[PDB]
Design a protein around this ligand. Sequence first.
Ligand SMILES: [Zn+2]
Ligand SMILES: [Zn+2]
Lengths: 147, 645, 183, 65, 120
Amino acid sequence: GKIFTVSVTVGQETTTANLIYSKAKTYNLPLYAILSPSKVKGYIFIEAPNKSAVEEAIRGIRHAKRVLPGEIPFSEIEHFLEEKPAVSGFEPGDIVELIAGPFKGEKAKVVRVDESKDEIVVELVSSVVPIPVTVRGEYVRLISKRQ
Amino acid sequence: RETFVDDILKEIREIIVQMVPREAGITDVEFEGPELVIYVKNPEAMMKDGELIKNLAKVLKKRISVRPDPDILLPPEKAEELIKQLVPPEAEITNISFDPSVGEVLIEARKPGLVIGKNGETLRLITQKVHWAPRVVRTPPIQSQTIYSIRSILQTESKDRRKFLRQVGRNIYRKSEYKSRWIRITGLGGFREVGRSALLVQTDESYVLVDFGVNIAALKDPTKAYPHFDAPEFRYVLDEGLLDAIIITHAALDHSGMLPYLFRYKLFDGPIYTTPPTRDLMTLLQQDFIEIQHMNGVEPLYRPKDIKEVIKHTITLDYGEVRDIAPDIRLTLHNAGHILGSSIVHLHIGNGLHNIAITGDFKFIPTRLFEPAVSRFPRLETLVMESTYGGSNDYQMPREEAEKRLIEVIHQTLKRGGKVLIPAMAVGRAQEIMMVLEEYARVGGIEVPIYLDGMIWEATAIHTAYPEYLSKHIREQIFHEGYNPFLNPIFKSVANSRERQDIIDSGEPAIIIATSGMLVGGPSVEYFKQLAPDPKNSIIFVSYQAEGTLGRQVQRGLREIPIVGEDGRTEVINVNMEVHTIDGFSGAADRRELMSYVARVRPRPERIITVHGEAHKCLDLSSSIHKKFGISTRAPNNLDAIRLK
Amino acid sequence: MYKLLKVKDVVRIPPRMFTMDPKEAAKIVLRETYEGIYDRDEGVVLAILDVEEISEGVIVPGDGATYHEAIFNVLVWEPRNQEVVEGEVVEMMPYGAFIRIGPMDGLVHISQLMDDYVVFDEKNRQFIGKETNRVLKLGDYVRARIIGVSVKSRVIRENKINMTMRQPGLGKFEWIEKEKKKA
Amino acid sequence: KERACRHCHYITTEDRCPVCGSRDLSDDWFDLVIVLDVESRIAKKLRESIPEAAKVPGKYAIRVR
Amino acid sequence: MIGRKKLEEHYITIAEAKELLERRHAEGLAENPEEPMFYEARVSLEHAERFAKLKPEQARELKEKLMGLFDWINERIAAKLVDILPEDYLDIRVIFAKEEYMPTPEEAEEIIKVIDEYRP
RNA sequence: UUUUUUUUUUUUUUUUUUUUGCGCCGACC
DNA sequence: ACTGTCTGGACTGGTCGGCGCTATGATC
DNA sequence: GATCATATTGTCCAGACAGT
Ligand SMILES: [Zn+2]
Ligand SMILES: [Zn+2]
């Protein structure tokens, strides 16, 4: 059908999607599918023939705020369904920020990238001596792209 | 990696329930660092005497820590009342703390010997009548800020400390007694150089780092200020988190300066095995180093929270206590005699496979402060020795005439009404000077007050907190007699700048022991500035003065020194005071002392490694040892790996 | 480089100096203000010679002191880049030699004294050559050219001066005479 | 805890896999996908990406790690 | 920046600075405190005394004949030549190489021959 | 019966001196 | 070019004292 | 039973403005 956006509480998109799915199953709502990417915070995607079905499905839930008044083209959310490694798309020599891990809130420079083990080796920029460290690909965020 | 800690714990529990009578009621058996903890419901039957605990410790070859079950716990007020009633009034108990999570009561007393008992029977009596496992620590006669802060940090983070100890105990006993296929020794720093010491002990199962330190002389160059972080073995150990433990020989910046840096960037998460005096002194020195780097305007190496994390990850070991820090490595500490808490690291890898002794900084002659270094070991194959004074012509003067000259110079200065200013290190020579002065003044030689400014008072308090780590004479005076040499009324502490100004402006003679040997900071510079024009005063140098420092300028004989004034104009200091230099109070071992230690060590090591000194000095010491005793000697450079077995 | 400048400035003279000569009080205030610091534009302020002209006082709100327009002569010393100086070695260091060329002391690096691999002698604080066998000691007439000037701060001692002796014609007076002997 | 299958990317609360009967399930997964209609556009997009996904309506995971 | 504005500036030799520093030392001695001046002024006076190659009047007369001799030179390098007092071609060559002009040997020889008089 | 690589010396210590805001209500001149 | 309409704003100074108010739902 | 992210988006006077 048509892709619609539902604004939900940040960090609790999966539970809201599960409640919407259970309500649709129990009450026979005309809901086609629900997509809740982990990278997107506070927003979920629901496929329905019309926005009235989405509005009727999300009502009665404290954690579903409102439905965005618009229709998303499928090309915008097409890349979300494709499975790609988090390490891929990273090149050595640039600067990244570590969102999670033991090095939370630290800037680092990418040194080595390998897609086989899904790990990326980075060097802290604030360290007085270069100490390479191995961190997960999804933990880092690209601040700038140079070389 | 694969672990078998559960099977080992099950076997240990089976052995315990086979040996311990059933009436004890054993509930839980777990590992807390390098010691075993057993929880029972009837402590009376478990420890009616020390023979059962001794037999259990001998059979299991572990440190047994019997604790009551948390369900059977007396109320804290009733427990405190019972503990106070049981302990004799001679032992003045100051603070009592309780741990609701695990059965343990911390007792702070001025006389821990009475609380512990003649053979530990008082601890058993307390934990039987009160159902609380007792831990006794000494309350120092002089209050120490660092020790109080460390104790408060340990008490306020009990849950994190217990979790860290449980993780360390699980990691240590991941497998049973394992015979290492090979033993490797690599030096990441401190090899053929002075400072930034770093020793890595590598086996096929566990890795051990020894005295991770920093260099202050070459702090401008990052390639020489810090140990070699680019070593492939060290990189592999740090990246995979295979570092089992870190052991610090003694509390100095060249042996413990780089320790908080690992915790700053979360490069390490295991335990640190130092003596409590070493831990306290190294925390004080690291805090002072961070403050100095902050004041100089440069970027600090780490933060005080990193020092707090180092405190939270430190396990305290006493002298002569054997603990298992790895599946194949056993660690014990022996007295070194260099400074307070200085320990010679002895590693027992395997079940008699090999033995390594890392002396570090040590002294082999008796001193006024500490006993000479331990030269007897149960087994010794490889010896790692310092070479600070390894030169052939390096011969420090004997102590007795050096202290006689110091005493006569001080007496001559005080005879004419002058003031004696003695710049000194925060730890080491300063306490020896205070002990010599106290001995001289105890017979009524001098009545003038002795003023300690800066870190001298804190170091003195830390020294008072651990009298068992001192020499036999001071131990006999403190324990057998009622006299404490550090508690002499002549020793006074100046609180603020007003007290220092009153001391300077006072016409009465006095002795001032500052905390900066090079007159590069602290109250030493102010004392020198305000006492230089007076010809009656004198300044005594007890340490080497580096080039480019004010102290070297005064020592060389400069009558006037141009300095920057408060208003931004050049100021001239007229040095009319007498200048003296007595370098006989150095805590480092002499070349003759090193040769005597090599000759008198038992058993004779198969090989000797000379480190911690200049390259030519290390080579000269190794060649002299090889020519005199025939033992094979090596003086490897940095990033050099030696396969001992 | 010694320089003489005529400077016009407004001088504040406190009421405690009202009974004194206006020129003398202005000179005292100027000596207290400008003497002993480093000026970025003019260099080291050495001394205030005399006050030529003085104007009538002006009283501003909030201050009882009088303000006068004064004309005075200042003697200053300014080090410039690529400037040859003559001085005497006063301090010896392992990393170089300090030569007193005036109100400030320059620094000549160990590689910079001469065209030879000179090493330091700690026992006598002298520099001994390998091939030339030349020795530098205290109280030696030397000549050098300034190559580095730091004006980062107003403190004279905090500023640093670097000079060179690699170039021909720079060195000890005896060495200079030895060089002129061949020519 | 909820774990996702490594074969059909199906999240189930029991050891048995009700789609392919696989015994290797991963406890770490992101980008939960809920399928209620087989002929959905996103279900068709997931079908060409992972062949075993979107066969039966239910919870699904984009990647398995 | 000293003062509000600068009226005139002049380059003086070592001897003039020595005379001014001696006058300031006398003025400081006339003052009640025993310290005539600060460290830098005393050091400058000592250096000028130890390098007092010529009398102040001799320095001034050498400066004015140097000004009247050639036009491309200025007061600063004239005072520099007075202080250095060269006696051959190598020193004047190495002190004029980094300057804005590279004079031919004939005028350098003329400068040597005029400054040869009244020299120590 | 066979092509296209290069080569050497100058920067020092184990460290230091005092409740803000928000709004309401009553009241005085 | 007039004429009714929409929008923005400021609402006398000081003083006295009192009386509340400054987190919450969901795992681990 | 302890912690952690998140927590929603009164009338009148004067100047500018569509309407005729
Ligand atoms: Zn050391
Ligand atoms: Zn499956």
